[PDB]
Amino acid sequence: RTDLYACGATLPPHLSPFVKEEKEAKELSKMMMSNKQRKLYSKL
Amino acid sequence: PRQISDIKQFLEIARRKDATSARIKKNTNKDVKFKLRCSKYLYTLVVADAKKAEKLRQSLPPDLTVTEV
Amino acid sequence: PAYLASFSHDDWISGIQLTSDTILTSSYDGIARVWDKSGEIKFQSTGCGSSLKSASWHIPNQSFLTASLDQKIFHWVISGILQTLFVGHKDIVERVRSLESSSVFISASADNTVGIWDFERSPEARSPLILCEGHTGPVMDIVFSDDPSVAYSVGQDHTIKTWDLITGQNVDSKITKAPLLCVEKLTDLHLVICGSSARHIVVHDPRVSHTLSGHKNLVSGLSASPENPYMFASVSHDNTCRVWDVRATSGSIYTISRAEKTWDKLFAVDWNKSIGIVTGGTDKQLQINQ
Amino acid sequence: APAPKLPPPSHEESYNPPEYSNLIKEKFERCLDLYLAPRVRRKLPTPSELRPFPTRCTNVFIGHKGRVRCLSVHVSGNWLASGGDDGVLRIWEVMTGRCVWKCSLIIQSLAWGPLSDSPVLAVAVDETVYFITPPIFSDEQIEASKELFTSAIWRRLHGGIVHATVSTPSSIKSLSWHRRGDYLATSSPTSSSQAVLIHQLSRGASQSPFSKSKGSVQAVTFHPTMPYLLVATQRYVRIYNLVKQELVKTLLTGVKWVSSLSVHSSGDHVIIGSYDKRLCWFDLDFSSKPYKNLRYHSRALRDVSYHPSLPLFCSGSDDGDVQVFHGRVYSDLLANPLIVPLKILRNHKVVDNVGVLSTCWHPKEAWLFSAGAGGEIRMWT
Amino acid sequence: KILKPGKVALITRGRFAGKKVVILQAIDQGSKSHPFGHAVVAGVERYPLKVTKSMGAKRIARRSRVKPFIKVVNYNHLMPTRYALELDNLKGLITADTFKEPTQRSAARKTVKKTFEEKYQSGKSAWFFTPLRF
Numbered sequence: 001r002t003d004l005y006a007c008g009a010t011l012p013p014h015l016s017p018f019v020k021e022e023k024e025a026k027e028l029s030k031m032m033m034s035n036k037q038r039k040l041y042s043k044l
Numbered sequence: 045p046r047q048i049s050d051i052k053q054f055l056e057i058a059r060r061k062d063a064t065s066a067r068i069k070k071n072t073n074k075d076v077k078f079k080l081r082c083s084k085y086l087y088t089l090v091v092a093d094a095k096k097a098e099k100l101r102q103s104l105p106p107d108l109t110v111t112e113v
Numbered sequence: 114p115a116y117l118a119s120f121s122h123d124d125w126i127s128g129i130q131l132t133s134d135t136i137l138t139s140s141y142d143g144i145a146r147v148w149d150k151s152g153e154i155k156f157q158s159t160g161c162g163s164s165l166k167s168a169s170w171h172i173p174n175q176s177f178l179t180a181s182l183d184q185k186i187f188h189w190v191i192s193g194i195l196q197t198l199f200v201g202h203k204d205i206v207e208r209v210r211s212l213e214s215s216s217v218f219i220s221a222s223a224d225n226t227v228g229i230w231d232f233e234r235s236p237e238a239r240s241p242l243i244l245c246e247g248h249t250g251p252v253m254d255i256v257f258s259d260d261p262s263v264a265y266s267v268g269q270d271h272t273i274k275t276w277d278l279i280t281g282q283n284v285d286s287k288i289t290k291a292p293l294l295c296v297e298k299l300t301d302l303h304l305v306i307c308g309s310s311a312r313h314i315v316v317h318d319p320r321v322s323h324t325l326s327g328h329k330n331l332v333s334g335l336s337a338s339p340e341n342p343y344m345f346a347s348v349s350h351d352n353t354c355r356v357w358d359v360r361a362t363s364g365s366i367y368t369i370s371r372a373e374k375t376w377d378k379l380f381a382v383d384w385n386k387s388i389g390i391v392t393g394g395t396d397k398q399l400q401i402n403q
Numbered sequence: 404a405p406a407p408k409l410p411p412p413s414h415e416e417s418y419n420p421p422e423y424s425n426l427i428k429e430k431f432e433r434c435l436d437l438y439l440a441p442r443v444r445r446k447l448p449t450p451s452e453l454r455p456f457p458t459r460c461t462n463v464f465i466g467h468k469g470r471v472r473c474l475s476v477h478v479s480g481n482w483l484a485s486g487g488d489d490g491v492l493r494i495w496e497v498m499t500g501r502c503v504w505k506c507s508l509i510i511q512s513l514a515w516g517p518l519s520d521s522p523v524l525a526v527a528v529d530e531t532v533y534f535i536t537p538p539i540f541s542d543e544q545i546e547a548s549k550e551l552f553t554s555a556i557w558r559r560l561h562g563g564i565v566h567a568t569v570s571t572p573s574s575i576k577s578l579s580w581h582r583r584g585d586y587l588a589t590s591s592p593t594s595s596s597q598a599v600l601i602h603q604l605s606r607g608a609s610q611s612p613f614s615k616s617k618g619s620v621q622a623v624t625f626h627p628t629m630p631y632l633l634v635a636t637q638r639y640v641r642i643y644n645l646v647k648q649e650l651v652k653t654l655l656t657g658v659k660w661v662s663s664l665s666v667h668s669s670g671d672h673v674i675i676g677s678y679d680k681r682l683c684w685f686d687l688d689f690s691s692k693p694y695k696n697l698r699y700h701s702r703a704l705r706d707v708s709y710h711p712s713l714p715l716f717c718s719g720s721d722d723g724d725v726q727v728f729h730g731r732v733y734s735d736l737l738a739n740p741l742i743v744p745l746k747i748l749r750n751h752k753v754v755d756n757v758g759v760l761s762t763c764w765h766p767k768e769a770w771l772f773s774a775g776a777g778g779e780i781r782m783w784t
Numbered sequence: 785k786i787l788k789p790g791k792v793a794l795i796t797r798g799r800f801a802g803k804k805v806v807i808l809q810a811i812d813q814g815s816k817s818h819p820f821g822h823a824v825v826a827g828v829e830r831y832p833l834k835v836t837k838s839m840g841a842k843r844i845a846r847r848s849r850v851k852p853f854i855k856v857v858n859y860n861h862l863m864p865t866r867y868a869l870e871l872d873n874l875k876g877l878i879t880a881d882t883f884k885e886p887t888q889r890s891a892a893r894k895t896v897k898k899t900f901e902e903k904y905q906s907g908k909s910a911w912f913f914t915p916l917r918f
Contacts, residue, residue, distance in 0.1 A: 013420045018412030024450055027744055031696045049652070052689035055736055103736040127499070141501055164503060182496075182503070184541060203541075204479060207498075223481045250767050251481060253498070269480070269767055292768055294498070310768075310784055330461050331784065350461060376463055380499065395500070573816070593817040660886060678886040703887045721887040756891045 046085045051100055054078060054089040058108055065109045068101060114338075114356070114389050114402040119372035120152045126393025128167030128179065129334075129381035130211070135173040135191070136388055138381075138399045139165035145179040147193055148399065150388060156192035161185075167254075167381070169211035169218065176232065178218060180206035186220055186230055199230035201240035208254040208295075212261055217242055217278050219264040221252035227266045229278045243281045248274055253293065254334075258319060259300035265319075267293035267307050273317060275305075287317050295382075297335035301342035302359055308332025314347050316359060325357050327364040333394065336384035346390045348382035354392045354402070373398035405444040407437055448743040453729060455713045456745045457769050460781040462500050466493060467778030470754070473512040473761045474774050478519050480766045482539075485780060486510030492526060494537060495780070497765070504537055506561040511576055518584045521548040523566070525578050525587055532569040532578070532589060538562050551584065555600050555609035569609065571600060577622040581630070588632060590623040599623050599634065601645075612645060621661050628670035635664040640675060640685070654691050656683050665709045665716065672732055672740060674716055676707035682718050684730075684742060695742055699726055702758065710764040715745065717771055719759030723751040725773050725783070752777045787812070787823055787859065790870040792912055795827065797861035800853060803827045804912050805862075806869045808878045812859070815880070821859040824878050826896045829853045831915040832904055850904055850913070852896040854878065854889065869909050873899045 004012065029036055048054050057063060062083040069077040076097045080087040091097045104110055124142035135155070139145035143161040145168050146154040155174075158165070163183035170177035176196065180186040185200035186209050204224035212218050217229045220241065225248045228241030235242055250270030257264040262279040271292045274283035291311035298305050304316045312328040314335065330350035337345040338356065344366060346356040352374050355365035371379055371392060379394030389403035410433065415422055450456070467487050474485035476497070483495040487510055494504035513526040522544055524535045536548045545564065553559070555571045573591035580587060587602040598620040602609045618636035625632060631651060632643045638661065640654035660678040667673070675683035675693070682697040682704060702722035709716040709730075718726045725748040731741040748771070751759055757776035764771060773781040787793070791807045805827030812821045833847040877895060882888040904913050 011419060014417035015420075016413040016415045016417065019415040024448075024744065027747075028448070029699075030742070050688050050690055051736060052686060052739070056689070100736060125499070125501070141499070164501060182539070204481065223479065251479070378462075378500070662886075703890070756887050757885065758887075 046087050048087050048089045051089065051091070051096065054080065054087065054100070055103060057082065057087050058104055063108060065111060066104060067111050067113075069113055114369070116369070116372055117389060117401040117403040118152055119398045119400040120146075120148055120154075121373075122146065122393070122397045122399060124164075125395045125397050126381050126399050127165055128169070128208070129383040129391050129393050129399060130168040130170045130177065131383035131385035131388045131391040132170055132173035133385060133387040135170055135175075135177070136383075136385070136391060136399075136401075137168035137170050137177050137179070138391075138393060139168035139179045140397070141165065143181065145177070145189065145193075147177065147189075147191060152401075156189070158187060158189050158193055158195065160195070161187060163205075166206055167208040169209045171211040171213050171218065171232075178209050178211055178220075178230070180209045180220060184222070184224075188232060197232070197235075197237070197239055199228075199235050199239040199241060201236075201244070202226065202228055204251070207252060210256050210264065212257055214261050215278075219255040219257060219266070219276070219278060221255035221266050221268070223251040225249065225251050225268065225270075227252050227255050227264070227276055229281075243278055245276045245278070245281050245283070247276070247283045247286070248272060250292065254295045256296045256298045256305070258298045258305070259303060265296045265298050265305045267296035271309075273305060273307055275319060285319075287322070289315060289317075289322065294331060295334045295347075297337060297345065299337040299342060299345060301337075304359065306335045306337070306345050306347070308335050308347060308349070312349065314345075314355075314357060316345075323359070323362055325362045325364065327357070327368070328355050329353065330378070333378065333380045334382035336382045336390070338384045338390065339386035346382055346384055346392075348379035348392045348394065350378040352377035352379045352394060352396060354379060354382060354390060356390070369402050371396055371398075372400035405442050407442060448741070450729065450743060450745055453731075453743075454745075455715050455729065455769050457727065457748075457771060457783045458746070459748070459783065460750070460773075461784045462782035464495050464500055464502075464780035464782070465778065466502050467491065467780075469778055470757060470760060470776040471774035471778060471780060472510055474763055474772055474780065475513060475515050475524075476763055476765060476772065477515045477522060478517065478766060482515075482522075483763075483772060483780075484513055484515065484524060485774060486513045486526065487774075487778070489778075490528070492535070494539065497770070497782070500782075504539060506563070508533070508535065508560065508563055511574065512578045514578045514580050516548075516584050517580050517582055520544065521551055521584060523548045523551065523584075525580070527575045527578055527589070530571045530574050530591075532571070532575060532587075534566040534568075536564055536566060538564055552604040552607050554597060554611050555589075555602065557607055557609070567604075567607070569602060571609075572597060577624075579624045581625050582627065586625070586630075588623045588625060590620050590634075592619045592621055595619070601632075612643070612648065622663050624664060624666055626670050627666055627668050633664060633666060633673065635661050635675065637661060640664060640673065642687075652687065652691060654685050654693075656685075656693060657696070658683060662704055663706045665707045667709055667730075667732060668711055669732060669734075672730075674707045674709060676704045676718055678703040680704055680720070682707060682726075682728075684740070686740060689739075694740070697728075697742075699744075700724065702756075705758070705760050706762050708762050708764050710769065711766050713764075713769050715764075715769060717762050717764070719762040719773060721753065721756065721758040723753045723758035723775070724749055725751070725759050725762060725771065727771070748773070748781075748783050751775050751781065752779070786864045787862070789875070790868055792865045792867040792869050792909075793825065794863040794865055794916070795825070795855075795857060795861060796863050798855075798857070800827060800829065800855060802916055802918055803829065803853075804865070804916065805855075805857070806874070806912070808854070808874060809876075817880070818856060818858075822856050823859065823862065824854065824856050824883075825862070826852060826854050826874065826878070828900065828913060832913060848901075848904060850897065850900045852893060852900055854893055854896060856883065867909070867911055869903075869912055871899060871903065 067079040124140040128139040130137040145158040163181040166180040184202040209220035229243035274286040291309035293307035295308040328349040357365040373396040393399040469489040471487040491507040573594040577590040642651040684695040700720040727746040754776035771783040805825035810823040830851040
């Protein structure tokens with residue numbers, strides 16, 4: 001639409017098309033050491 | 045050879061895949077010896093009590109090959 | 114019921130028994146004060162030697178039993194004179210209920226037994242006439258049911274046992290998921306309200322249990338209001354007297370705050386028609402709501 | 404040739420998003436990464452229905468002006484006796500919270516007797532142990548307790564009904580009672596040769612059942628189905644058969660320092676609290692190695708206790724948190740014990756970097772008594 | 785009276801042999817648990833590494849970290865030394881009650897660690913923080 005991008009008008013943010021029970025569940029870390037994979041929950 | 049003094053240890057080693065066969069040895073003093081052939085050691089559990097003997101024997105996994113004296 | 118007045122006491126008001134005129138308040142200091150309607154203590158029990166547990170007057174301005182931590186219940190006849198002391202319980206008598214018609218009065222004790230003490234028939238220093246047993250845990254409280262020959266008994270075993278004083282055995286023991294601390298029998302509704310440790314009042318039908326939550330802490334005592342049979346007040350460990358309704362099981366109908374507070378814990382609750390609802394506890398002040 | 408893992412595309416940074424001289428440098432860095440960066444190609448325990456669980460504290464016992472070293476509950480379940488560094492022994496009514504016995508008479512530990520008819524308390528002050536029978540009980544209980552008895556030397560006040568004082572060379576740290584009430588186990592970590600002493604009340608004598616002790620002894624207790632004595636040393640836990648006077652089993656805790664121990668009522672399971680912030684579950688029929696290790700506490704774990712009847716156990720640590728676990732044990736060989744978290748009780752003060760010092764369980768219901776360093780006793784219901 | 789709270793000394797017996805310690809508090813009279821002239825000391829278990837004009841602040845800080853220890857040591861196992869190290873942060877924090885209380889032992893160890901951090905960074909007692917080569 002021309003009115004949006006007329007000379008000297010406002011510019012919408014240019015978007016990149018490339019850009020695309022709980023307590024017990026979280027605390028169940030029995031003796032597992034290396035099996036503990038809370039690294040994924042801490043990043044993702 | 046290794047001696048195991050714990051019944052649940054005997055079951056755990058029996059559960060382990062390295063277990064190949066099991067022998068039940070009935071002695072003249074009414075004491076049974078549960079022997080478990082693994083890859084590296086013959087694990088032996090000396091059960092002097094009769095009632096604990098057969099509950100253990102039925103506790104042994106069905107896939108394991110258990111053999112008479 | 115709007116609050117009327119509060120009367121101070123030496124210690125926490127362990128037991129409260131409110132009549133039309135007489136109001137017995139037994140405290141942890143070993144003294145049971147018979148406060149009048151206005152609040153004048155007619156007489157104070159002396160020489161108990163142990164912390165008083167519960168008070169229960171067989172008749173107003175008359176003999177009133179008061180249990181103590183020494184496994185003895187002293188019957189003061191009204192100034193109050195200790196006519197006789199009923200003793201023999203293995204542990205301290207947790208609570209005592211008075212029966213006007215029958216000389217046998219039930220008394221739940223910490224020894225997992227409910228003893229039926231008698232004014233004269235007791236084995237005299239007077240062994241209870243019927244020391245009923247059967248509760249697995251300590252007998253927290255006992256209240257006579259609609260029939261004078263039966264009395265409900267709640268205890269730590271979470272089993273409310275309807276012990277028949279005539280037979281000396283529990284006819285039916287209703288088990289619950291939480292331990293009950295106080296038992297109050299409402300004859301008009303034919304129900305028994307149990308103050309379970311889960312901060313819930315369970316109204317169980319003797320002939321089955323309707324649970325009502327809302328109390329912030331454990332319920333310490335229960336008493337059905339004479340004016341409204343459906344309404345029953347319950348003083349809890351949160352120093353609050355939650356007056357719930359049988360029809361309105363969704364929480365208490367009206368939560369009355371104690372006149373005096375100190376982490377206070379209300380312990381004793383009574384419901385007299387003339388005197389209203391009398392409450393007491395760790396605040397060492399017996400408040401009245403009319 | 405595994406792919407060089409193409410760089411991520413534009414991150415939505417533009418002329419004006421609501422979220423170049425260096426371009427040669429990033430391109431050079433990318434070229435460097437193409438040959439310098441290595442390329443690599445890459446149950447349900449359901450605690451809801453098994454709720455023997457308790458909840459937040461409801462009764463707070465106050466009156467101790469210092470740390471509460473140890474507290475215990477009588478078999479009847481209505482008396483709770485507590486003591487601390489203040490030297491004040493206070494007996495509390497569990498249902499009401501009154502402090503009926505204000506008489507004081509440091510208190511390292513105090514333990515009730517197992518016999519209901521003989522309510523006698525063994526209380527340790529420094530190297531001395533007092534056998535106290537408070538007059539709060541009925542008189543016949545006092546006489547019933549007297550005939551129980553009436554190395555370490557024996558000697559025979561605001562109601563100070565003292566019966567038999569036991570004096571020991573060292574400051575006793577742990578006290579334990581036998582099931583029959585005839586044997587008292589007193590342990591001190593300082594000593595060695597005579598670190599632990601066994602006292603026979605019926606014979607009125609004390610002895611050292613150990614000729615040679617290895618490692619400092621931290622705590623001791625009695626087996627609940629057999630006379631075996633459980634000795635928790637600094638690093639090991641050793642099982643001793645007393646009737647034949649020998650060593651049955653040694654548990655390798657894998658722990659730098661053992662704090663306290665508790666025993667399952669079945670006698671086949673042991674739980675070890677450690678200064679290494681670890682709870683150690685041992686199945687005596689499984690292994691000398693710990694069946695499970697739990698490292699949830701943030702500070703040194705002080706005490707571990709199993710409820711005598713309900714399948715719940717708790718751990719008290721110096722961080723102020725009390726960890727409540729549900730442990731279900733079956734007699735079957737297949738059925739390994741089921742250990743699940745149930746609750747983490749909080750809101751407990753820490754004084755001088757000291758938190759939950761001692762935890763005790765109600766003999767009947769799921770009630771937990773926790774002693775803090777500020778002199779407060781919490782009754783979690 | 786050459787062993788006083790605040791005197792630097794050397795340990796010649798035990799695991800921490802050849803390490804330099806500061807006398808935290810002397811029990812020259814002895815104790816029931818330690819029937820000898822023992823004294824509690826705080827020492828440096830791992831000495832900080834040497835630093836240079838170069839290396840970033842990250843590496844300098846990484847090499848400047850110090851691991852302490854606290855230990856009751858016999859006088860016959862301590863070797864007294866003329867240098868003296870004093871700071872009010874390390875006065876009276878240690879006692880027998882601290883050793884029995886393991887959380888207090890760890891807390892005192894961490895406090896000693898921190899105190900050694902500011903002391904090393906400030907450049908005091910360079911000899912005390914220099915390891916002894918034997």
